[PDB]
Amino acid sequence: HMMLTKELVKEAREKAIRMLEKACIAITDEEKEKIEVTDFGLGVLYTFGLEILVYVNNERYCAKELVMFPRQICPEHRHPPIGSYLGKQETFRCRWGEVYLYVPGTPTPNPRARIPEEKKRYFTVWHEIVLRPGEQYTIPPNTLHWFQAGDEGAIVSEFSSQSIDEKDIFTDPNVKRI
Amino acid sequence: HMMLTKELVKEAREKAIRMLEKACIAITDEEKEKIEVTDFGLGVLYTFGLEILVYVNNERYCAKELVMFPRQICPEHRHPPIGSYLGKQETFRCRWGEVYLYVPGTPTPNPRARIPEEKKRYFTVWHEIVLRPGEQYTIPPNTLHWFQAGDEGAIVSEFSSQSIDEKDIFTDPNVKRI
Ligand SMILES: OC[C@H]1O[C@@H](O)[C@@H](O)[C@@H](O)[C@@H]1O
Ligand SMILES: OC[C@H]1O[C@@H](O)[C@@H](O)[C@@H](O)[C@@H]1O
Ligand SMILES: [Mn+2]
Ligand SMILES: [Mn+2]
C-alpha cells in the first residue's frame, strides 16, 4: 500500500514497454520515456492503475494506448461536459489480452471483474461488455464506466474526442487523477 | 491496366488481411469483409491504391488502418473545408514497414519515391517525411500530400478529425475516390 515512487514508476513503465513490444506495437525511445503511470492516487498501482501512451491529443481528436497489467482496474469515472465542450466520447478497441468494461444498464449476472471489498461502494455501473482482441465499444460523454483487465492484462486503444484528464469525475472520492 | 473486379478486390483484401495479421493487428471477421480496396479509379491498383480498415468515423473523431502493398502510392490530395467544417486534420503513425510522405515545403533532394512518368505531372509537393514504425506526422487541413510505401509495403494508422472521403480534392483529374 505504497506511495508512487520514481522506482515504482520506472518498473511499471518498463513492464508496459515489454507488453507493447510483445504485442508488436512499435514505440519510439521518446515515447518510452513519456508513458504515463498513474495509481489514481490510491497507492496500490497493481490493483488500481493504468499505464498510458498518448499518441496524439488536440482539440479535434485524441488517440492513446492504455496498457493494463493483470487484473489492473481503472476506477469508475465519467468525462463530463466542461463549458461548451460536450465531454469526451471515446471508442475502446482491445488490441491484446482481454478487458471487462462496465457501463450503465441492466446488471450482468456472473460479472468477470473482481473488486476489493473496501472499494465495492465505488462501482455503481454493472452492465458488462467483454472485449477480446479486435473488439470495440463506444462510450458517450458523461457516462460512468470502469474496466478491469483479465488475468494476462490487456492493451486497449482509445480513439476519442479531445482528452482533458484533469476534468474527469471519479466516483471514488479518494482518486486524484494526476 | 485493369478495371477493379470482384476478384481483384478479394485478392487485395486477403493480402491486406495477411499483412495486418503478420503485424499482430487483430481484426474481426466482420472487419475482414469491410476492408475497402480502392484503385482511385486509375485501373492499376498495385501502383495507385490503398486498402483501408475504418475503425471508427464520426463527427468528433476518426481512426483508420491504411494498408499499402510494396510501393503502392496514394495519389496527391487535400482534405478541404466544406461549409463550416475546417477540413480533416490527420496524424499518420507508421506501424509496420515504411512510408514516404510528401507535404508542401522545400523539395527534398534524392527523394525515395518512384512515380510513373505518365503521372509525374500530378505530384506537386516534394518535401519528404520518411516514417518508420512508431513514427508520426500531422497534416493540417487543406494541405496537399501523398505517400508511397517502401519495398515491403506499409501499414499506417490514421488518427483524425471526421473523414469525408467523397469530398477530398485530388490533383490528378482522373481520380475517382469511390
Ligand atoms: O482519466 C482516466 C482514464 O480514463 C480511461 O477511460 C480513458 O478515458 C483514459 O484516456 C483516461 O486517462
Ligand atoms: O481519400 C484518400 C485517403 O487519403 C489518405 O491520406 C487518408 O486521408 C485516408 O483516410 C483517405 O481515405
Ligand atoms: Mn474513459
Ligand atoms: Mn490524407
Numbering used by the authors:
A (entry chain AAA), B (entry chain AAA): -1 to 176
What does the article say, verbatim?
Here we present the biochemical and physical characterisation of a thermostable lyxose isomerase from a Thermofilum species (TsLI) which shows high thermal stability and is highly specific for the substrate lyxose having little activity for other sugars. D-lyxose isomerase (LI, EC 5.3.1.15), is an important aldose-ketose isomerase reported to catalyze the reversible isomerization reaction between D-xylulose and D-lyxose, as well as between D-fructose and D-mannose and several other D- and L-sugar substrates. The overall fold of TsLI is a cupin-type β -barrel, with two α helices at the N-terminus, followed by the cupin barrel made up of two antiparallel β-sheets. The conserved manganese binding site is located within this pocket and is co-ordinated by the side chains of residues H75, H77, H143, and E88.
